Amino acid sequence: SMEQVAMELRLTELTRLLRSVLDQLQDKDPARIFAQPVSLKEVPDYLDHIKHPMDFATMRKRLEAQGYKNLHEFEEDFDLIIDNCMKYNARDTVFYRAAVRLRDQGGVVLRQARREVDSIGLE
């Protein structure tokens, strides 16, 4: 139907915006601490601690499959990256501190993304 196509165009548009958001968020992780899934070889007990692992590579895969239906879903995954890290790692670690900085710097980007999605009406 034309309606299905129209909705698919909207999703494709949302995906374009979220790709820009994702790039901006990942730029705030220049150490690439969150670039890839935590290695279960390097950290064999990780899944005993963290029940829903997340990372930028995994988000990017879901994104390119047009797997985010709205900004909320995307934000959920971003928050998993930060929240998982701040639980597994102690306060005095480079990992925890990187998560705090990513959360803080990233709030700015996500604040504008919310306004843009609403105004352009992408969801």
Ligand X SMILES: O=C1Cc2cc(O)ccc2N1
**25 counts as binding ligand X under rule CB under 6 A:** no
* Residue 113 exposed, middle or buried by CB count within 10 Å (0-12, 13-18, 19+): buried
**95 counts as binding ligand X under rule CB under 6 A:** yes
Query: Of the listed pieces 2-10, 21-29, 88-96, 112-120, which binds ligand X according to CB under 6 A?
Result: 88-96
**9 counts as binding ligand X under rule CB under 6 A:** no
Q: Which position among 14, 18, 21, 38 is part of the footprint of ligand X (CB under 6 A)?
A: 38
Tell the smallest beta-carbon distance from residue 22 to ligand X (Å).
20
**85 counts as binding ligand X under rule CB under 6 A:** yes
Q: CA nearest 121: which of 2, 31, 28, 11? A: 11
DSSP H helices in the chain: 2-26, 46-49, 56-64, 71-88, 94-120
Q: Which position among 58, 70, 89, 105 is part of the footprint of ligand X (CB under 6 A)?
A: 89
Tokens for 123? 């969801």
* Residue 75 exposed, middle or buried by CB count within 10 Å (0-12, 13-18, 19+): middle
**54 counts as binding ligand X under rule CB under 6 A:** no
Q: Which residues bind ligand X (CB under 6 A)?
A: 38, 42-43, 85, 88-89, 95
